Amino acid sequence: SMNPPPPETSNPNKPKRQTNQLQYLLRVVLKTLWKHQFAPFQQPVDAVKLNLPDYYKIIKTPMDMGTIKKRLENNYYWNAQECIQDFNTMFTNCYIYNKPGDDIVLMAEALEKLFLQKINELPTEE
Numbered sequence: 001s002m003n004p005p006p007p008e009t010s011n012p013n014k015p016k017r018q019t020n021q022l023q024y025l026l027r028v029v030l031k032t033l034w035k036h037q038f039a040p041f042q043q044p045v046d047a048v049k050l051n052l053p054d055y056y057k058i059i060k061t062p063m064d065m066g067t068i069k070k071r072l073e074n075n076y077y078w079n080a081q082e083c084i085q086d087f088n089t090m091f092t093n094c095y096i097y098n099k100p101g102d103d104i105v106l107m108a109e110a111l112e113k114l115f116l117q118k119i120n121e122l123p124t125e126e
C-alpha cells in the first residue's frame with residue numbers, strides 16, 4: 001500500500017563518467033521521450049495517489065524517467081548500458097503490472113518505439 005524509498009540518483013562512492021553515448025541518452029533519448037504527449041512515467045509510481053496498493057508487491061525494480069533524468073543530469077552512470085537498462089526496466093514494469101490493452105501499456109509502447117529508434121543510432125565511443 002505504502003510507497004517505497006525512490007531509486008538511488010546520488011551515490012558519491014559509485015565511479016562516474018561523462019561520455020558521448022551518455023550525452024546522447026540525455027540530449028536525444030530522454031529529451032524525445034520526456035516531451036511526448038504520453039510521457040505517467042515522469043516520476044516514480046505513486047501507489048498511494050494512483051490507488052495501486054499491489055504495485056510494489058509486484059514491481060521489485062521500480063524505474064521512471066524522473067529518476068533517469070536525475071541520473072543523467074547528476075552524472076550517476078558509468079556507461080550507456082546502465083541507462084538503457086533503466087529505460088527497459090521502466091517499460092518492462094509497465095507491461096508486467098498492467099493488464100494487456102490498457103491505455104498505460106499503449107503509452108509505454110509509443111515511448112518504447114521512439115526509444116528503440118533513438119538507441120538504433122547510438123554514436124560510437126569517442
Ligand SMILES: COc1cccc2onc(N)c12
Nearest residue numbers: 040041045050094097098104
Ligand atoms: C498514471 O500512471 C499509472 C497509472 C496506472 C498504472 C500505472 O502503471 N505504471 C504507471 N506509470 C501507471
